[PDB]
Design a protein around this ligand. Structure first.
Ligand SMILES: Cc1cc2cc3c(=O)[nH]c(=O)nc-3n(C[C@H](O)[C@H](O)[C@H](O)COP(=O)(O)O)c2cc1C
Ligand SMILES: [Cl-]
Length: 130
């Protein structure tokens, strides 16, 4: 169960920004966060473990983008969205966010994986147009 996912280890090797959540815990909080994610967001590891990643959202984040993540999770569909996120210091960035369920043999979702890619403002407008 623990980081023995090939794909998690692949992601660390590529120095990606990601978190793992555990939905058997109430509110599906973060139980792993990569150094990339911490550097991107300005948070320390002990500021994110045990928190739902919605803390990155703020008043100018689009509730429809968030709604699309929520429904993806409910319907067990992989999702990709571009949404505005906030770092610890309150500065904002556009996050191309990729979320997938990690399932066992029986089809049970044992974790979720989220990978963040920081994108430019121009990238985000173009994306959100289509
Ligand atoms: C593994 C995982 C990673 C992320 C990473 C991010 C992120 O880098 N920025 C962000 O802005 N929201 C995220 N989310 C969404 C958030 O944790 C909530 O799932 C949504 O806000 C919808 O739920 P509700 O707020 O409606 O309850 C995630 C959800 C999961 C499961
Ligand atoms: Cl969630």
């Amino acid at each position: 169960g623990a980081m023995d996912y090939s794909l998690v280890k692949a992601l660390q090797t590529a120095q990606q920004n990601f978190v793992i959540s555990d939905p058997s815990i109430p509110d599906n909080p973060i139980v792993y966060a990569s150094q990339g994610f911490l550097t991107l967001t300005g948070y320390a590891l002990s500021e994110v473990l045990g928190r739902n990643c919605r803390f990155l959202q703020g008043p100018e984040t689009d509730p429809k983008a968030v709604e699309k993540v929520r429904k993806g999770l409910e319907r067990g569909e992989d999702t990709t969205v571009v949404l505005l996120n906030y770092r610890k210091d309150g500065s904002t960035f556009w996050n191309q966010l990729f979320i997938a369920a990690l399932r066992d043999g029986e089809g049970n979702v044992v974790n979720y994986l989220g990978v963040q890619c920081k994108v430019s403002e121009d990238y985000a407008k173009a994306f959100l147009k289509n």
